[PDB]
């Protein structure tokens, strides 16, 4: 019960920033504003939690140390370490109910809360395990994250589906108006499993991926997911509900195919958006032979019209959309050409990269 360690500032900074990720909101329980510090046999462990998830960093201690644990205010501790000079050695020790931080002739005495009071997620068992490059996991999350709901009463929508099938890992996100689905080959035969990760956990997991060559190891339990990246361990509770099935959301036979440049389509929708209704964001699309016309109007009777040359041979049709949902998709599709697959005025549209079927996007129209 006399915790003590000495570590170089540059070995402490990234782990402090990382474990602090889950902290921030309305700080209800005081100890949730603190990081748990634990010294044991050559390792300093730092933990941050919001009760739903936890982020752990392990720092190898190359200098003498004494075992123990305490919790210290996260922001104050991080700001102290970040404020010290490049190359500073940071000596930390518990002294009664205070944690001391010393470096050069700089001395800081921080208040603490007992390590025994720090909340831990209940012990659990892994059912699924696989490793993948960080860049693959980043691509999966980034291709769909924007389609998650925020605060929907259907709580299973305020998160992201993580699904293993055959040799692929898939992400699905939907808010009841639009849906995004992406799948990537993992190169390992996998059991079939589907879990919902809470949206705050998705964002945190996204934050811990530096795209770097350190591989990502995932472990999935019945009520938890865990990701190991280098010296970091992220664990989150899962969302217990029935996620929608993308296979049933994808338009059955979208016979009308339109092809156009992704940037040209995105810029035309972005200019039309300026004169759309600020609340409803409605745009009107008219498709005719090798032409798309985008129109927007607002309550001041202001109007935007964009005419584009496209590839289209189907029947003429009119269809309305929330322009932010369309722009979100085009922004996520970082490609040269896009394909929009239409049915009729009252049916969803499927949008994808004309050169790749790895991701698919489904947008429900608006009544014109």
């Amino acid at each position: 019960s006399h915790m003590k360690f000495t570590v170089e500032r540059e070995h402490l900074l990234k782990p402090l920033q990382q474990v602090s990720g889950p902290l921030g909101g309305r700080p209800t329980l005081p100890i949730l504003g603190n990081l748990l510090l634990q010294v044991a046999d050559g390792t300093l462990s730092l933990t941050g939690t919001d009760l739903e998830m936890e982020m752990v960093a392990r720092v190898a201690l190359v200098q003498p140390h004494e075992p123990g644990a305490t919790t210290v205010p996260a922001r104050k501790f991080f700001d102290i370490c970040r404020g010290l000079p490049e190359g500073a050695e940071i000596a930390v020790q518990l002294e009664g109910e205070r944690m001391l931080v010393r470096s050069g002739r700089s001395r800081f005495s921080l208040s603490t809360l007992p390590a025994a009071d720090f909340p831990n997620l209940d012990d659990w068992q892994s059912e699924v395990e696989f490793t993948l490059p960080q860049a693959t996991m980043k691509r999966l999350i980034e291709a769909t994250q924007f389609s998650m709901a925020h605060q929907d009463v259907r709580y299973y929508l305020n998160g992201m589906l993580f699904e293993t099938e055959g040799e692929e890992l898939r992400t699905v996100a939907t808010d009841g108006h639009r849906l995004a689905v992406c799948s990537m080959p993992i190169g390992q035969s996998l059991p079939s499993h589907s879990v919902i990760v809470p949206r705050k956990g998705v964002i945190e997991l996204m934050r811990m991926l530096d795209g770097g060559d350190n591989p990502l190891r995932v472990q999935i339990g019945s009520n938890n997911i865990r990701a190991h990246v280098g010296d970091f361990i992220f664990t989150s509770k899962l969302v217990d509900g029935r996620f929608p099935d993308y296979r049933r959301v994808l338009p059955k036979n979208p016979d009308k195919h339109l092809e156009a440049g992704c940037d040209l389509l995105k810029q035309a929708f972005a200019r039309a958006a300026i004169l759309s209704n600020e609340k409803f964001r409605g745009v009107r699309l008219y498709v005719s032979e090798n032409q798309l016309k985008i129109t927007a109007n607002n309550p001041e009777q202001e109007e935007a019209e964009e005419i584009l040359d496209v590839t289209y041979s189907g029947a003429e049709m009119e269809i309305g959309f929330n322009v932010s949902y369309v722009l979100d998709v085009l922004n996520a599709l970082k490609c040269e050409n896009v394909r929009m697959m239409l049915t009729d005025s009252v049916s969803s549209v499927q949008i994808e990269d004309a050169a790749s079927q790895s991701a698919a996007y489904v947008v429900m129209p608006m009544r014109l």
Binding site: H177, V249, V362, M366
Partner: peptide, 5 residues
């Protein structure tokens, strides 16, 4: 806005 499901 129409519902997707």
């Amino acid at each position: 806005q129409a519902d997707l499901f």
